[PDB]
Ligand binder design. Structure first.
Ligand SMILES: Nc1nc2c(ncn2[C@@H]2O[C@H](COP(=O)(O)OP(=O)(O)OP(=O)(O)O)[C@@H](O)[C@H]2O)c(=O)[nH]1
Ligand SMILES: Nc1nc2c(ncn2[C@@H]2O[C@H](COP(=O)(O)OP(=O)(O)OP(=O)(O)O)[C@@H](O)[C@H]2O)c(=O)[nH]1
Ligand SMILES: [Mg+2]
Ligand SMILES: [Mg+2]
Ligand SMILES: [Mg+2]
Ligand SMILES: [Mg+2]
Ligand SMILES: [Mg+2]
Ligand SMILES: [Mg+2]
Ligand SMILES: [Mg+2]
Ligand SMILES: [Mg+2]
Ligand SMILES: [Mg+2]
Ligand SMILES: [Mg+2]
Ligand SMILES: [Mg+2]
Ligand SMILES: [Mg+2]
Ligand SMILES: [Mg+2]
Ligand SMILES: [Mg+2]
Ligand SMILES: [Mg+2]
Ligand SMILES: [Mg+2]
Ligand SMILES: [Mg+2]
Ligand SMILES: [Mg+2]
Ligand SMILES: [Mg+2]
Ligand SMILES: [Mg+2]
Ligand SMILES: [Mg+2]
Ligand SMILES: [Mg+2]
Ligand SMILES: [Mg+2]
Ligand SMILES: [Mg+2]
Lengths: 205, 109, 422, 120
RNA sequence: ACCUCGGAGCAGAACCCAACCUCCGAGCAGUACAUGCUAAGACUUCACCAGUCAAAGCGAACCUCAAUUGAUCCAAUAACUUGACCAACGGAACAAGUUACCCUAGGGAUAACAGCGCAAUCCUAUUCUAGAGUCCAUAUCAACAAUAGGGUUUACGACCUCGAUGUUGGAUCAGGACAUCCCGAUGGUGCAGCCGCUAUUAAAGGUUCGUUUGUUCAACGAUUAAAGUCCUACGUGAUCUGAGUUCAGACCGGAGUAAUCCAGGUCGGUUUCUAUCUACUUUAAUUCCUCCCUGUACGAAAGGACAAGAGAAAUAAGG
RNA sequence: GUACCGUGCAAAGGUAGCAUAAUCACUUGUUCCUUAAAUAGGGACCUGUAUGAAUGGCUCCACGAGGGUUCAGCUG
RNA sequence: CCGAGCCUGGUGAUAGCUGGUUGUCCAAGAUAGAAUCUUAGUUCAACUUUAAAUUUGCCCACAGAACCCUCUAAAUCCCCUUGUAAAUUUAACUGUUAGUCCAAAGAGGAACAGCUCUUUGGACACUAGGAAAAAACCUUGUAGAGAGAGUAAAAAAUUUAACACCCAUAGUAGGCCUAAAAGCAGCCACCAAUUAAGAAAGCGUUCAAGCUCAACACAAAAAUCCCAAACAUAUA
């Protein structure tokens, strides 16, 4: 079963309790599915966002059509949509209670792998349609190999080491210099200024 | 569809932290469940509130938990605990300050 | 959305509505197939109920209506009710909904919903929007009740039009926009047809009742693989042309079409005229008949009425070549009417005979002449004939350095040939 | 929520490079700080306002002498973004009762005990 | 729909925290009759009321439960004690509809118009290269999606205006944008020619008259080169009209016992203002058609052009 | 069950008549006449489950500053 | 001027509603909630003011404050020193209890709103300077005169797409399939000759033929009319 598996619109056992839109699940760096497993290539999410069944279908169809089943295999690195998003009836005034469950999404944080590919192939053979899918994804995304991912991580480390700026967001925020914690967020003490909402600034050091 | 849930906060919790001088009868902490267990010179009310039985200094410690043999649920928990495991709970003690009393010369018969 | 449905079939037993070609069991089976096609929910319960008078605010006589009310309200599994009727008026819908405490759907609404669900192309989406406009206009009352908010006749300012009346105005403009968009779509489809019309590709429009195997037959004839027939109803929801060769080595475009159902508002199917006009601009029409289906005659009537309403040219209506599909399901089937071809698309049984018959029909209908023509070799005339006509047999006369070619050639190509190579 | 900021301890652990840069030996640390409020307490939390008032730094650009002891240092850490801290230097040592009236705090941070207002 | 009480999230860690926010529950039950009497010290639902825990002592033996409830007065009782889904649950001892016949005090603290925020909705443009287009992503489109832009709709918000910002259509006059309907220039075409389709540029000029309907629109009739999409307080009522809507009258269907009412229909129904201020009040033309080109180029035919030339008009401006 | 043949219930099951009505909406109902063109007007309909008989129903003589439509003429 | 006349009187009716509420000067002064036929109000609390009594008030070192829950934050509570000078209590009161934006953690909405609702903090409802004009962003506040002085915050930067040249014989029209499908309609195989060439990655042929390729070799647009003028180079 090398081809990418079908993803259901909603969990077979639908959720009954409406739950809040905890955007923290999109905010910040991803702590899961950050490393390769049984594969050499992937789509890395350089930003946070919610994946719908439409995005899942786009990924599945594009990758299945463009891959070579006898030499390539793909695997989801993100769970099927589980977080329920509720929408009220069109033109409804505010109030009256939380809306009914409309769709299901799956959160994705910056730095996560969405799909992972492997098999008897090199990067150039796959990067094309992986970049197509990444560009059509709801967040910034990039087709990345193991080598390229390691290269970008090492480049980030090198920039952090050799930056000539005496002042770093990390230092200033941690020391509360200028009292900038009045303007910053508690999440910023760990994001180090590289994250802003759902957006991940990679050039940011 | 969602009714109720308007109850206010019980204002429960610790009323006397460690190092606080506490007179006899003072309520040290009010709790819904057994968060802090009664230590030395600390009594429990019907509602699990801890009150000082003596006049002294409140001290919070971590002590091994040995439930009463007739406390069936706790005894079952222990019976299922692996060998070498020891339960610990937070206990509140009142280290009495004054002595029970003094012997005073009342009459030189 | 995951809506267990109770099927209610009003069986008319006297007067108008007493169908003489179909039975309540067959109609119930068709409605069950419709809901299964709609997918995601099933008929939790089925109820066929007599109705001497089918036209009422409550389709059923008070007694049967109360009986159904008791059953529906006592059955908790039921989430919706599907009333097997063409169209139900807003009063009937409102009264039944209030009585039964559920949502009521008629065949019109069910077909509309399946279209909206399984419509992919923007053309299909626009056409189904047009088809929905009737359902909208019917349902504004319920739809915009909550927006109305029980305010009327007391506000003295603004556009004098009431809430309901200005909603009618907005829906009028919405329908006007939809119709303008479909006119633009019709123009674009004419642009698309231009090239094939100029090249004079014979075109055969495959029509018939829904789930007759139109798509399967087109797949069998063309030999394609991307063509995917479905068990569901209303699978083919777009009009597309597929090239296939005939025994005479002639290429023909089979045009797949939307399926037809009986007991539906005409406007529903007629809203797809923007893309079904390819049938009007066809050269032959091939009518597929699921003879195995018990309701074959009723389906015949429905499809013929639908075509007449679509206003295809009468010459095209005539000469409709009839193929009886699904013959394998009916073992030992003997066609009765002449000029009818029994075929089995899945098993590919009578496909050769069908191909020959429709080849003859194309020759008759496209003004194409099969004739023997003598040409000179090395003069490019042979290559020209290959490219601009379908050559069938080349008998070379080496002594004269020439060749007699048996070619099926249209009059336009014949004139071009006679002028280019006198 | 915006809350009081806990400065990690490592921030206040000087390095040899810092010692070279700022001219202060870790051994034999300075006894007294000269602290001047160079920033307004407006738009700052009430706790910082109160700490400034406690330190007596209500007037800006007005040097105040404070002990270089852990508690005063904790307060100064709380309000460090509003003040300039320098080490009080005593080139002629502590002023004596005789010269108590001739002292002056030069901008360099030195409390000279003779102020003649004459050319050198 | 809800109104009182409790538990869990929101509210991760002392306490406390809203929501017509998300979920669960309560209006008891059971056992006991010392669930007897007293009394330090404390807690406290952010007040009070109420509600909690409790050492010691007397007298004895040797309560479970989160909520599980309700004050005062007043009634019953010899007394002890008892009494409300007073659930609008800090509780008027006992009182419903309807008003367009309406009135007063206010409110832009609060709706309808308009403006405004936003852009869900709506519209437009690119990217993606699946799918239509016989073959062919890109002549013309285009699914899943992605990225942008616009502020025409329906909304949503309630920020100015309720010691008045007069309201839909129409007349009059039009100012503006271009995302161009026609006229001009140009690229592509599934551009043979004629019609066309598409895109770039172009806002100087133009963009019809009628039958119903109050209609903006739409349908239809006849035309046109075309009968463009919009903004302008859905431009313009101190310039006009009031047919619709939207007072007071009345009928039909329906609701109600009735008053009276209707997202219903229908007949009628008062359009004020003498201008103080600002502003303003005399600033090389387009298009169609006729003949000819020409029945020519083109085309198998059908049909059928440009350009050049000649002549005619129509509108618009000025006389 | 196949309008008529039985049947349940009711106080009786809306009868005659008229009918897209000044009669909820569907509504610009479907048709024919009328107009070049009609959401208007008039004539009809298995047309009202919200018509209907002194809460009066149908018919038509005259009448009407009532409300529609209209021939011909007339005219800024 | 009749949904019920007019006049007089009760009558200075009542109004939680609107409006108004008149000398000078100084000072303190914006602050949680509860109940309420209550949310346009009021009483209590909180805050605020005044006077008085007394002694601790704020900041805060360790130590200390739960499992459920596997991990799980900014912090908080408590708190000697220390820096400070306020705090509690007593007496008497009013007024505010219709609130805005900003940063942050959230909830509702649509991860819209100058939207709504809580929490921590700030500012504004007060002065001044800046961000153009500017309640809420930044600087800064305790007040007067000065024809002195040092400073605070404080002025946006960006310009982006060229890409080879030469050459191609051939086991053979590899088999099967088909009328034909010969690299190229489809399936299997995909070896192999030449120094070097896929039993062919694209056009093309009905099929062939022919053309190449891989190989040898050398961003944007809206409606009255754009919107300071301009300026790349004289030492921070
Ligand atoms: N032709 C044919 N179809 C059969 C036969 N038996 C079963 N079928 C089914 O008939 C169905 C026909 O599907 P399509 O050919 O897509 O139907 P269609 O006639 O194009 O109609 P739409 O589904 O509306 O597009 C398929 O599910 C077949 O499996 C048979 O003997 N012949
Ligand atoms: N505590 C209490 N007082 C009551 C109760 N019922 C009536 N009352 C008293 O009586 C008042 C109510 O009067 P009603 O409503 O006439 O009482 P009723 O019993 O229904 O009728 P009557 O006996 O005719 O007065 C209350 O406000 C009390 O004063 C009750 O259940 N509990
Ligand atoms: Mg709670
Ligand atoms: Mg089909
Ligand atoms: Mg209290
Ligand atoms: Mg109450
Ligand atoms: Mg009236
Ligand atoms: Mg009034
Ligand atoms: Mg508005
Ligand atoms: Mg307002
Ligand atoms: Mg508000
Ligand atoms: Mg005024
Ligand atoms: Mg343009
Ligand atoms: Mg508008
Ligand atoms: Mg009127
Ligand atoms: Mg009536
Ligand atoms: Mg009227
Ligand atoms: Mg009149
Ligand atoms: Mg006037
Ligand atoms: Mg005038
Ligand atoms: Mg007329
Ligand atoms: Mg009078
Ligand atoms: Mg008064
Ligand atoms: Mg003051
Ligand atoms: Mg000053
Ligand atoms: Mg080459």
């Amino acid at each position: 079963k090398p081809k990418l598996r079908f993803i259901e619109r909603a969990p077979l056992v639908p959720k009954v309790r409406r739950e809040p839109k905890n955007l923290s699940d999109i905010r910040g760096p991803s702590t899961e599915a950050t490393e390769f497993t049984e594969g050499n290539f992937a789509i890395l999410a350089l930003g946070g966002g919610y994946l719908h069944w439409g995005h899942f279908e786009m990924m599945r169809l594009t990758i299945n059509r463009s891959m070579d089943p006898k030499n390539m295999f793909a695997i989801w690195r993100v769970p099927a949509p589980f977080k329920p998003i509720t929408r009220k009836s069109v033109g409804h005034r505010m109030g009256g209670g939380k809306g009914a469950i409309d769709h299901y999404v799956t959160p994705v944080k910056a730095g996560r792998l969405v799909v992972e590919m492997g098999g008897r192939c090199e990067f150039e053979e796959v990067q094309g349609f992986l970049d197509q899918v990444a560009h059509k994804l709801p967040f910034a995304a990039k087709a990345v190999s193991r080598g390229t991912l390691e290269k970008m991580r090492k480049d980030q480390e090198e920039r952090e080491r050799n930056n000539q700026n005496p002042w770093t967001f990390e230092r200033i925020a941690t020391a509360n210099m200028l009292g900038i914690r009045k303007v910053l967020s508690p999440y910023d003490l760990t994001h180090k200024g590289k994250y802003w909402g759902k957006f991940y600034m990679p050039k940011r050091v | 569809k969602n009714l109720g849930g308007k109850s206010s906060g019980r204002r429960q919790g610790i009323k006397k932290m460690e190092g606080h001088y506490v007179h006899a009868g003072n309520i040290i902490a009010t709790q819904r469940h057994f968060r802090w267990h009664p230590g030395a010179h600390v009594g429990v009310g019907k509602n699990k509130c801890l009150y000082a039985l003596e006049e002294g200094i409140v001290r919070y410690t971590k002590e091994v938990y040995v439930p009463h043999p007739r406390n069936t649920e706790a005894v079952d928990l222990i019976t299922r605990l692996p060998k070498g495991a020891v339960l610990y709970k937070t206990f509140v003690h009142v280290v009495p300050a004054k002595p029970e009393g003094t012997f005073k010369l009342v009459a030189m018969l | 959305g995951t809506q267990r449905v109770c099927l209610v079939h009003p069986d008319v037993k006297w007067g108008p509505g007493k169908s003489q070609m179909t039975r309540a069991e067959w109609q119930v089976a068709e409605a069950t197939a419709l809901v299964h096609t709609l997918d995601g929910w099933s008929v939790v319960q089925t109820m066929v109920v007599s109705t001497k008078t089918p036209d009422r605010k409550l389709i059923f006589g008070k007694g049967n209506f109360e009986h159904l009310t008791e059953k529906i309200r006592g059955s908790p599994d039921i989430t919706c009710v599907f009333l097997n009727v063409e169209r139900m008026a807003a009063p009937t819908k409102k009264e039944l909904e209030a009585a039964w405490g559920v949502e009521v759907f008629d065949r019109f609404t069910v077909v509309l919903h399946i279209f909206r669900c399984n419509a992919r192309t923007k053309e299909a989406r626009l056409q189904v929007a047009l088809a929905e406009m009737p359902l909208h206009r019917s349902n504004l009352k319920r739809d915009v009740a909550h927006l109305y908010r029980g305010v009327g006749s007391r506000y003295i300012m603004g556009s004098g039009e009431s809430f309901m009346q200005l909603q009618q105005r907005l829906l009028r403009e919405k329908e006007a926009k939809i119709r303008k968009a479909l006119d633009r779509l019709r123009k674009k489809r004419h642009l698309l047809r231009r090239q094939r019309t100029r090249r004079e590709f014979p075109v055969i429009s495959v029509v018939g009742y829904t789930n007759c195997g139109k798509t399967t037959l087109i797949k069998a004839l063309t030999g394609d693989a991307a063509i995917q027939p479905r068990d569901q109803l209303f699978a083919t929801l777009d009009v597309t042309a597929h090239a296939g060769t005939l025994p005479s080595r002639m290429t023909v475009l089979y045009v797949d079409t939307i399926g037809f159902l009986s007991q539906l508002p005409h406007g529903l199917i007629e809203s797809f005229s923007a893309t079904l006009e390819d049938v009007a601009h066809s050269d032959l029409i091939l009518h597929v008949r699921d003879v195995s289906h018990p309701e074959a005659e009723l389906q015949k009537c429905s499809v013929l009425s639908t075509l007449r309403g679509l206003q295809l040219p009468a010459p095209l209506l005539d000469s409709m070549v009839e193929v009886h599909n699904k013959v394998d399901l009916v073992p030992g089937y003997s066609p009765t009417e002449p000029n009818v071809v029994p075929v089995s698309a899945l098993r590919g049984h009578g496909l050769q005979e069908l191909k020959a018959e429709l080849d003859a029909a194309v020759l008759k209908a496209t003004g194409r002449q099969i004739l023997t023509l003598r040409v000179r070799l090395a003069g490019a005339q042979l290559s020209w004939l290959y490219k601009e006509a379908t050559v069938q047999e080349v008998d070379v006369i080496p002594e004269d350095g020439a060749a007699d070619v048996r070619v099926i050639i249209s009059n336009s190509a014949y004139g071009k040939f006679r002028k280019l190579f006198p | 929520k915006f809350t009081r900021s806990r400065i990690p301890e490592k921030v206040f652990q000087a390095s040899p490079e810092d010692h070279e840069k700022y001219g202060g030996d870790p051994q034999n640390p300075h006894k007294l700080h000269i602290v001047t409020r160079i920033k307004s307490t407006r738009r700052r939390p009430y706790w910082e306002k109160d700490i400034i008032k406690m330190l007596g730094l209500e007037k800006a650009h007005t040097p105040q002498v404070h002990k270089n002891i852990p508690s005063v240092n904790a307060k100064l850490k709380v309000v460090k973004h509003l003040i300039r801290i320098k080490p009080l230097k005593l080139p002629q040592g502590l002023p004596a009762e005789e010269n108590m009236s001739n002292t002056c705090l030069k901008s360099t941070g030195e409390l000279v005990v003779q102020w003649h207002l004459k050319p050198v």
